[PDB]
Amino acid sequence: GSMAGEDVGAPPDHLWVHQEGIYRDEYQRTWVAVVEEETSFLRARVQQIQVPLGDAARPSHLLTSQLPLMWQLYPEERYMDNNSRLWQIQHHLMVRGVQELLLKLLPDDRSPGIH
């Protein structure tokens, strides 16, 4: 509902990682995921921007696996992931056709180095 004025019909009901830090929509458009952290969270900022498809086998996304192989839209405006953790929406919106989506992984065992 954060898509005020510049509505988007509906958010990407899945995001499928396909390229290096890059998800794809159901609408077949590419979504660059970056990350920041908060005082008990990690927050992926996913941003829809056109890059050439070409499946990059996901060494990054295995090795990291903070951000998932797949996200799946969920009630209360959240996203489940394929790893069975859950990312709360902090916004879904769009600006001049660039969709952006803040996804906030609910409190995890954030061990040092890796989690």
- Named CATH topology: Proto-oncogene - Oncogene Product P14tcl1
CATH architecture heading: Beta Barrel
Strand order of the largest sheet: 1-2-3-4-8-7-6-5
Order of helices and strands: EEEEHEEEE
Helix content range of the residues, please?
A: under 10%
What is the molecular shape? Answer: globular
State the separation between the terminal residues, measured CA to CA.
31 Å
CATH superfamily: TCL1/MTCP1
Radius of gyration: 14 Å
Family: Belongs to the TCL1 family.
GO molecular function, one term: protein kinase binding
Keywords: Chromosomal rearrangement, Proto-oncogene
Function: Enhances the phosphorylation and activation of AKT1 and AKT2.
Short description:
The protein is mostly beta strands and 115 residues long.
Please explain how this structure is put together.
With 115 residues, the chain is mostly beta strands. It has one domain (1-115): Beta Barrel (Proto-oncogene - Oncogene Product P14tcl1). Helix content is 5%, strand content 46%. The protein contains 1 helix and 8 strands. Strands 1-2-3-4-8-7-6-5 form an 8-stranded antiparallel beta barrel. β7 (86-95) and β8 form a beta hairpin. The radius of gyration is 14 Å and the shape is globular. The relative contact order is 0.23. The PDB classes it as gene regulation. The entry lists the keywords beta barrel, gene regulation.
